């Protein structure tokens, strides 16, 4: 037999090694026949100066369209020669190129990743084609109201800072986008000490270290101007954006406050707060017996189509709040109920709700880390954000330190009597005024 | 055209209260009494007004 803490102790440790270039090579080994090998780069949309806003996204587009060593679709044929999956993403703070493959082809895939690191050919016809593709997928992403509300919340919460700008940038920046600025972005944001080569699954750390010493040696190592690029803090602004368009059937409203960041440990406690409120959508099967009071009230009074709670963290900043889609005729009531729950966590957080939130957080933390791909993502983001892979046993020790007193203290620290950021989209006439929301962010009875 | 009893903003209250109010069919004479109280109240007021005119 084994308990939960012993089972978390039996999880293998992530091996981390360094290169002479400054590359962080990290690996977690399991007994799987597949593996996920990726490169995580500390270069998002926060590093741009408002004239190269779509640069990293456009690099993510051109990254898979041929290199100097492998010109064109033959590169793609190589990824389809071994049955490998080639995926990528770009965020406001990170960029990742990852490949799922088997273990027997574990050398060549690393070399393929090395190609996409440092030999990305940028043909001008490919620039025009990917410009058309970027415009097509921005006008496709305009249809999804959730991403529009996410971008509106980031635009109104961090105004005047490099964190307000979107990952894809404005349309005019896509139109006038040259090649010289892409070359400058690749030169000054794809350096060796801002890169983690992460592997998860059927890997060996010594073989992966040898492959990184062979292929990923001498990536840049040079700032090319002796000017280290840094990140200034971003000022949070309590504000409100309302996009009124009554032709849409449903309205999406997000309300957030300023989060602590990555390294500030009360994040973990704040996760428990989200685990008290949770998420709900109309496809669930709990009815009125759901544990969350907001979800039970929303089911009983037919208030919301769906809601979710988020704790998004960036370098010493973040957003912390809720996002719900509902019809117009319920919007105000939903806001009221949501605010009440927050003040409940600021005033009367009980021990049973704290225990349930701790169990939900343990389930979420372990259930996310299944398969090689989310483990590799966890390794890359842990070496990029915390500078180390935080083990699951340390997460269990951090969860066990939480009782109701420090939970309501942290919720009073971050939620109580604070100016929120409100982003609305749709028939949002009944969305309350900012004075009403700011009044609802505190209780007269405390 | 329209129904003036149900659509006028003042006559809607009288229609909802004393005209089209749903009431139990089997209430006895004791259910008169409270209404009588209201009538007696205004009777008092009327008499009191004239008793305020010479006192």
């Amino acid at each position: 037999t084994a308990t939960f803490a012993q089972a978390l102790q039996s999880v293998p440790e992530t091996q981390v090694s360094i290169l002479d270039n400054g590359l962080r090579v990290a690996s977690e080994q399991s007994s799987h026949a597949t593996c996920t090998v990726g490169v995580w780069i500390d270069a998002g949309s926060r590093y741009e100066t408002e004239k190269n806003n779509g640069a990293g996204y456009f690099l993510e587009h051109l990254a898979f369209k041929g290199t100097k060593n492998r010109p064109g679709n033959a590169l793609e044929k190589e990824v389809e020669s071994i049955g490998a999956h080639l995926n990528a993403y770009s965020t406001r703070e990170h960029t990742a190129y990852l490949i799922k493959a088997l273990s027997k082809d574990l050398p060549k895939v690393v070399e393929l990743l090395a190609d996409i690191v440092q030999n990305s050919s940028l043909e001008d016809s490919q620039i025009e084609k990917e410009r058309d593709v970027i415009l097509r997928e921005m006008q496709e992403n305009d249809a999804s109201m959730q991403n529009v509300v996410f971008d509106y919340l980031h635009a109104t919460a961090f105004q005047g800072t490099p964190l307000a700008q979107a990952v894809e940038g404005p349309s005019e920046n896509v139109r006038r986008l040259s090649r010289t600025d892409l070359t400058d972005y690749l030169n000054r944001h794809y350096k060796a000490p801002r890169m983690v080569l992460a592997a998860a699954g059927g890997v060996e750390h010594q073989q992966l270290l040898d492959l990184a010493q062979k292929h990923l040696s001498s990536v840049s190592r040079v700032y090319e101007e002796d000017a280290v690029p840094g990140l200034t803090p971003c000022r949070f602004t309590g504000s409100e954006i309302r996009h009124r368009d009554d032709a849409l059937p449903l309205a999406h409203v997000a309300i957030a406050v300023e989060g602590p960041g990555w390294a500030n440990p009360d994040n973990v406690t704040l996760q428990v707060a989200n685990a008290i409120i949770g998420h709900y959508d109309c496809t669930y099967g709990g009815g009125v017996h759901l544990s969350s009071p907001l979800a039970s009230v929303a089911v009983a009074n037919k208030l919301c189509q769906s809601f979710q709670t988020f704790n998004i963290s960036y370098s010493d900043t973040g957003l912390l709040g809720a996002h719900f889609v509902c019809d117009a005729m319920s919007i105000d009531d939903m806001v009221f109920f949501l605010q009440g729950q927050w003040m409940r966590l600021c005033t009367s957080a009980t021990e049973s709700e704290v225990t349930r939130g701790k169990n939900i957080l343990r389930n979420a933390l372990v259930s996310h880390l299944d398969g090689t791909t989310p483990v590799c993502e966890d390794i890359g983001r842990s070496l990029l954000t915390y500078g180390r892979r935080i083990p699951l046993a340390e997460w269990e020790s951090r969860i066990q330190e939480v009782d109701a007193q420090m939970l309501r203290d942290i919720c009073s620290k971050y939620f109580y009597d604070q100016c929120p950021a409100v982003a609305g989209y749709g028939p949002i006439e009944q969305l309350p005024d900012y004075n009403r929301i700011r009044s609802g962010m505190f209780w007269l009875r405390f | 055209m329209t129904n003036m009893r149900k659509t006028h903003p003042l006559f809607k209250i009288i229609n909802h209260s004393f005209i089209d109010l749903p009431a139990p069919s089997n209430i006895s004479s004791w259910w008169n009494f409270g209404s009588l109280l209201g009538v007696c109240l205004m009777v008092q007021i009327i008499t009191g007004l004239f008793l305020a005119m010479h006192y």
Partner: protein, 78 residues
């Protein structure tokens, strides 16, 4: 390779429907919402035909002809 839903690669969640009675800790992708759609109009019920004599004449034998009047009710012939 058994598990038909996993054997079909891209058509894995199209050939199989997955729901839940108790929500998980992990939030699902594409939460989804039913928009407020229209409603069909309410019409009075029609006569059933539960005897052989009432079914006499109910079978179509001609091309279908619609007719809309102004102050005449709209009719149709089989």
């Amino acid at each position: 390779m058994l598990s038909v839903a996993a054997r079909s690669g891209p058509f894995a969640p199209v050939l199989s429907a997955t729901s839940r009675g108790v929500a998980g800790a992990l939030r699902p992708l594409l939460q989804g919402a039913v928009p407020a759609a229209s409603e069909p109009p309410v019409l009075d019920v029609k006569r059933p035909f539960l005897c052989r004599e009432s079914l006499s004449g109910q079978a179509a034998a001609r091309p279908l002809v619609a007719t809309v009047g102004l102050n005449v009710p709209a009719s149709v012939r089989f």
